[PDB]
Design a protein around this ligand. Structure first.
Ligand SMILES: NC(=O)c1ccc[n+]([C@@H]2O[C@H](COP(=O)([O-])OP(=O)(O)OC[C@H]3O[C@@H](n4cnc5c(N)ncnc54)[C@H](OP(=O)(O)O)[C@@H]3O)[C@@H](O)[C@H]2O)c1
Ligand SMILES: COc1ccc(-c2nc3ccc(F)cc3c3c(=O)n(CC(=O)O)c(C)nc23)cc1
Length: 316
């Protein structure tokens, strides 16, 4: 298993990264320090996670300790939905860079295709609980992202939570300057994404799988929801390999030529989750895990189902 995948800008992206959504600010600095100590070189960030300063502290410390140099790290962040207007994009990127204490990002993603009304609130609501959209569109936001590459703020740009038609809209954009390098999407045995992965990979777009463990800490979880980490069928595959269920769930997307970004703030789990380069899932294991698909999302952006750019009405 080579540890990096080649992107369209010529750069190599580590296939295993550390996720940081729901990593509380008071716990995430140590998590990122441990991750770097045990070998992670890719960190998945976002302004909306409200913890980029604390991520940046950890990175700074490890640079100053001589543990890693900047060129070996692969730092990803994402443009939040309230900043899709072309005149807001650069400032949003520069705020992430300032918080992270970096002079460039390796990859910057449009976090969701949906633009929201600009303002302080991340999910601005009217008086009936509907997300207030903005008058923004994918193509104009993409053009603003391209400017970030041309100014040296980011090495590559990509998208997240885009369906294949939304990806196609960018690919077919008149005067396209940069193709998306990555589409970061939810992917796990209950939502295997066969059609969207096939589409993206056929267009030379690398796919990153988010919520690979099923996001058991997501804030809207219901007790009756399916649970990957507790699935006895996956536990049995793990036992046969003398690995944990989480390790199987991380190895799975790696064998599909995906990047994967499991999140933890628990030092033992951070180290456990990286120890996935010493075993292989069999053809039968892969087939079996793919067979668990139920088209089941844990991140369905349910407050935005009437937005013009809501991504999940399309089959893929
Ligand atoms: N682009 C998007 O729209 C989007 C959406 C969702 C997620 N993401 C990215 O993807 C990352 C991963 O997804 P996620 O955070 O939703 O969830 P996840 O990585 O599927 O699961 C994280 C949860 O699993 C626990 N965990 C981690 N390792 C474990 C292990 N070895 N054994 C048992 N439990 C374990 C964590 O607990 P502790 O942390 O308490 O150890 C946490 O509760 C995010 O953090 C974010 O960076 C992006
Ligand atoms: C009812 O429909 C819903 C409910 C909740 C979320 C959600 N809310 C957030 C609120 C504040 C915040 F900082 C991040 C959120 C976030 C957030 O950061 N993520 C993670 C992501 O988008 O990467 C996700 C997936 N969702 C939220 C979204 C839609």
């Amino acid at each position: 298993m080579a540890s990096r995948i080649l992107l369209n800008n010529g750069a190599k992206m580590p296939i295993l990264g550390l996720g940081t959504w729901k990593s509380p600010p008071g716990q995430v600095t140590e998590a990122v320090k441990v991750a770097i100590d045990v070998g992670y070189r890719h960190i998945d960030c976002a302004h909306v996670y409200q913890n980029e300063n604390e991520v940046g502290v950890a990175i700074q410390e490890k640079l100053r300790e001589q543990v890693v140099k900047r060129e070996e790290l692969f730092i990803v962040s994402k443009l939040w939905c309230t900043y899709h207007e072309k005149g807001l994009v650069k400032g949003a990127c520069q705020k992430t860079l300032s918080d992270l204490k970096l002079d460039y990002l390796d990859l910057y993603l449009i976090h969701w295709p949906t633009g929201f009304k600009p303002g302080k609130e991340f999910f601005p609501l009217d008086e009936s609980g509907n997300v207030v959209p903005s008058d923004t569109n994918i193509l104009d936001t993409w053009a603003a992202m391209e400017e970030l590459v041309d100014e040296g703020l980011v090495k590559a740009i990509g998208i997240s939570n885009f369906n294949h038609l939304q990806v196609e809209m960018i690919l077919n954009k008149p005067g396209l300057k940069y193709k998306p390098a990555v589409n970061q999407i939810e992917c796990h045995p209950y939502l295997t994404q066969e059609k969207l992965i096939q589409y993206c990979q056929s267009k030379g777009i690398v796919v990153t799988a988010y919520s690979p463990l099923g996001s058991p800490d997501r804030p809207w979880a219901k007790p009756e929801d399916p649970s990957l980490l507790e699935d006895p069928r996956i536990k049995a595959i793990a036992a046969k390999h003398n690995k944990t269920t989480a390790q199987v769930l991380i190895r799975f997307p790696m064998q599909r030529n995906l990047v994967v970004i499991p999140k933890s703030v628990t030092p033992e789990r951070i180290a456990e989750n990286f120890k996935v380069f010493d075993f292989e899932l069999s053809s039968q294991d892969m087939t079996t895990l793919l067979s668990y698909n139920r088209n089941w999302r844990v991140c369905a952006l349910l407050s935005c189902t009437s937005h013009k750019d809501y991504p999940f009405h399309e089959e893929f």
